[PDB]
């Protein structure tokens, strides 16, 4: 066997949790021991911008959020038990990284 | 440094700034009793937020009130231990933090000469530095008067402490009167009602101009 | 103490006060506040005491650390001018050498016809940028070097 890390991030809240939940449900029952889906930070990205193209009078200034959230999953299964679980549909728009070590 | 730690064993027990028992004094007048925080305890810095309510500013430790009307004068410019200032003024172009030191050294410099609990000399300087009568250029009904207006115990205190804190910064001006001193030599002479307190010269004039006009 | 005076004479006939040794030399043009405390070390005096508490014997130890400082110690960036007019290795500057050396190099440029020398004659900073309205309301920088 081979301890795999699924490191899964997404740009929006609804898309990331459904995959994290589904990954912990399908893997649960087979030849997998699975450590729980741990939430790491939101590296919230602030873009802080000038609205007005005149830059004139008072110019009201847009605050921007890009929030990118990262769930992490350790798993003890084969490379074949890994693809079976990576079958799932996945939101657009959800990055799934795989490191493989023994 | 060892006296400093004795000043940490002693406030514990309980006493203001390390060695002034808050029982030494009493508020003899029943006017300035609910308006003053002589009776409660230990530290001014507190950060207990005031002006929250109608009289959320009466319960302010007398000394904390002192610290931030003694902190007042301040714009823009930048302070740090560097080369670096002024930026914290002849009255804290900056914080109550390095303010609280001044008032402590002024309690030290007013204790050194008078030898009384200095919280008996300052609470004796904020019942005398307040004028008992004021004229407002008040017009009511379109008719311009300059009138008898009597002063409230809360607005008394404020004119007492502020005139004490306004007088010292005219004297400290580029002068050996350090505010730790210039305040400590204002607080003795406002307690006395002396002819040397720029704070008891307005108290009087504001009642005396206001008596003429009535 | 080492024999009180209020006026001892140091660096020729120019006067040493009663302020503090490190501040009394700063005035003597050529010796500053960092260079005063470099010559207190070599000579062997207490730096924080008053000026004027000097016998005759201390006043001679300073005048020979001044004539040539690069002989006693004083690093080749911690001396007054290092590498002078392309052929002197290091020198000393004092009220007469500093006044002459800076007017010389200015006498040099005006003949050269540069954009530094005529920019010191018209009334201007050369690299400080704005002459647009600074020295404002009739005012003046005083350029180099002394209006006291």
């Amino acid at each position: 066997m081979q301890k795999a890390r699924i490191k899964i991030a997404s740009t929006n809240v609804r898309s990331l949790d459904e995959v994290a939940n589904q990954i912990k449900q399908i893997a649960e029952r087979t030849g997998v021991r699975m450590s729980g889906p741990i939430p790491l930070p939101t590296k919230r990205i602030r873009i802080t911008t000038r609205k007005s193209p005149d830059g004139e009078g008072s110019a009201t200034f847009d605050r921007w959020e890009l929030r990118v959230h990262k769930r992490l999953i350790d798993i003890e299964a084969d490379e074949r038990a890994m693809r079976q679980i990576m079958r799932i549909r996945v939101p657009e728009d959800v990055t799934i990284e795989i490191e493989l070590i023994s | 440094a060892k006296p400093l730690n004795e000043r940490f064993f002693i406030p514990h027990e309980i006493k203001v700034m390390g060695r002034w028992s808050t029982e030494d004094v009493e508020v003899r007048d029943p006017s300035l009793k609910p308006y003053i925080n002589l009776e409660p305890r230990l530290l001014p810095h507190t950060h207990g937020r005031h002006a929250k309510k109608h009289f959320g500013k009466a319960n302010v430790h007398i000394v904390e009130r002192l610290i931030n009307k003694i902190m007042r004068s301040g714009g823009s410019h930048y302070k740090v231990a560097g080369h670096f200032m002024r930026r914290e003024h002849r009255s804290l172009n900056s914080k109550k933090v390095k303010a609280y030191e001044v008032v402590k050294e002024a309690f030290k410099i007013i204790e050194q000469r008078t030898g009384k609990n200095p919280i008996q000399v300052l609470v004796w300087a904020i019942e005398n530095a307040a004028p008992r009568e004021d004229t407002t250029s008040v017009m009511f009904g379109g008719i311009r008067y300059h009138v008898a207006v009597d002063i409230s115990p809360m607005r008394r205190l404020d004119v007492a402490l502020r005139n004490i804190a306004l007088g010292a910064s005219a004297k400290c001006y580029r002068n050996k009167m350090s505010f730790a001193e210039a305040l400590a030599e204002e607080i003795i002479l406002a307690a006395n009602k002396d002819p040397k307190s720029y704070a008891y010269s307005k108290k009087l004039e504001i009642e005396r101009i206001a008596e003429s006009s009535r | 103490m080492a024999n009180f005076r209020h006026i001892v004479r140091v660096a020729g006939v120019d006067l040493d006060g009663n302020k503090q040794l490190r501040w009394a030399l700063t005035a003597i043009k050529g010796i500053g506040i960092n260079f005063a405390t470099m010559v207190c070390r070599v000579a062997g005096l207490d730096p924080f005491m008053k000026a004027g508490y000097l016998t005759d014997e201390q006043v001679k130890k300073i005048e020979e650390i001044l004539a040539d400082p690069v002989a006693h110690g004083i690093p080749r960036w911690a001396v007054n001018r290092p590498k002078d007019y392309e052929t002197g290795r290091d020198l000393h500057l004092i009220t007469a050498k500093l006044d002459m050396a800076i007017r010389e190099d200015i006498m040099r440029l005006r003949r050269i016809r540069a954009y530094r020398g005529i920019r010191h004659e018209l009334g201007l900073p050369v690299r400080g940028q704005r002459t647009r309205s600074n020295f404002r309301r009739g005012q003046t920088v005083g350029v180099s070097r002394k209006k006291k």
């Binding site: 008072s58 | 514990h12 027990e13 409660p40 305890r41 230990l42 530290l43 507190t46 937020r49 | -």
Partner: protein, 135 residues
């Protein structure tokens, strides 16, 4: 013995405190209460410990770790938690009501902490406008 873990939070100095029985230990971020240089914010920490008594201060080990920016900030997070560490210990309403009548900065934090710097019309600070003079 016992382990009663509490918290104390004022203007984002979060104090992590533990109250177990022992011999008069006062630990702050690893160092005794002695290491601090301002006398002042020390006395603030010291306020509750006398209101109850030295009796219970001597009989109990207090270790706190205050991860908070302020010097007075640390102290304040230390004032709120000791007081809550001593009210969980003995259990009575006598030590709780005695704190509340004195000050509410022993047993209430804030409802508020800090406000953002508003976009503003090209100047410095949340609440400020560029100076005018065009009249």
């Amino acid at each position: 013995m016992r382990i009663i873990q509490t918290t104390g939070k004022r203007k984002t100095a979060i104090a992590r405190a533990v109250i177990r029985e022992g011999k008069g230990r006062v630990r702050i971020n690893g160092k005794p209460v002695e290491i601090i240089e301002p006398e002042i914010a020390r006395f603030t920490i010291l306020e509750p410990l006398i209101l109850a008594g030295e009796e219970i201060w001597n009989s109990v080990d207090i270790d706190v770790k205050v991860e908070g920016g302020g010097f007075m900030g640390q102290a304040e997070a230390a004032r709120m938690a000791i007081a809550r560490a001593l009210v969980e210990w003995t259990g009575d309403m006598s030590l709780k009501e005695k704190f509340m009548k004195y000050d509410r900065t022993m047993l209430v934090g804030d409802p508020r902490r800090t406000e953002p710097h508003k976009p503003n019309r090209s100047t410095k600070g949340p609440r400020a406008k560029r100076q005018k003079s065009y009249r």
